[PDB]
Structure 1
Amino acid sequence: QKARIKLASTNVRSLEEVANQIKQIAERTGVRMSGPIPLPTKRIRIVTRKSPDGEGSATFDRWELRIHKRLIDIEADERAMRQIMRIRVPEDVTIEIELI
């Protein structure tokens, strides 16, 4: 009777906007929602040699990509379920919903 929502994006602000929209949807209805839980960030780190050839001193680049995550639990209410089913997320945010 509860739904679990997982959010992930490479931009923090869009994630915050989507979470706030879900929070307000839950607020405008009588329904209990466990707050957005922040899960640990994913860091993808790649270290590469800079020069194309092998002459000279060795210097390195450290490229990094960060992926943020959030977790939200809400109880399945059809009046509130339709609203979150129709909210539109930006193209740089991934959302997945499941019933437990």
Structure 2
Amino acid sequence: MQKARIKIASTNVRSLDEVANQIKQIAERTGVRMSGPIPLPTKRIRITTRKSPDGEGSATFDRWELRVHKRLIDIEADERAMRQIMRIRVPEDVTIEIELIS
């Protein structure tokens, strides 16, 4: 057997969930065993910076963070099911990387 691992990565929660919903309904319409969406741990990239532009004032800093979420979908080999994922409307904030695994 063969299964495609689909990585869907986005900063926006709702667009990622929408793409996951689209893949879900695609898989359940195409009659393909699709291991449900597995959200991998969300990455929180954090950068700290002092707020005083000049050298004066008490030591005051802020931590600015980016939260990026990722989902993994294992979908069984169905070339009919694999032709239609290429028609998925991918928002600009979402990216999809599909690999094949025996």
Return the alpha-carbon distance in structure 1 between the equivalents of residues 91 and 11 of structure 2. 12
- Alpha-carbon distance, 1:15 to partner: 0.3
- Alpha-carbon distance, 1:86 to partner: 1.6
Deviation digits for residues 14-68 of structure 1 (CA, Å, limit 9, x no counterpart)? 0000000000011112210101001101011111111112122111111111100
Which runs of 4 or more aligned residues in structure 1 lie more than 3 Å from their structure 2 counterparts after TM superposition? Answer: none
TM-score of the pair, normalised by structure 2 = 0.93
Alignment RMSD, CA only?
Answer: 0.9
- Alpha-carbon distance, 1:13 to partner: 0.2
Return the alpha-carbon distance in structure 2 between the equivalents of residues 17 and 73 of structure 1. 17
- Alpha-carbon distance, 1:92 to partner: 0.6
3-state SS of paired residue (2:91): coil
Q: Where does structure 1 lack aligned partners over 5 or more consecutive residues?
A: none
- Alpha-carbon distance, 1:88 to partner: 1.8
TM-score of the pair, normalised by structure 1 = 0.95
Q: Percent identity?
A: 96
Q: Give the count of matched residue pairs.
A: 100
Return the alpha-carbon distance in structure 1 between the equivalents of residues 95 and 80 of structure 2. 23
Q: Where does structure 2 lack aligned partners over 5 or more consecutive residues?
A: none
Q: Which residue of 1 aligns with 2:46?
A: 45
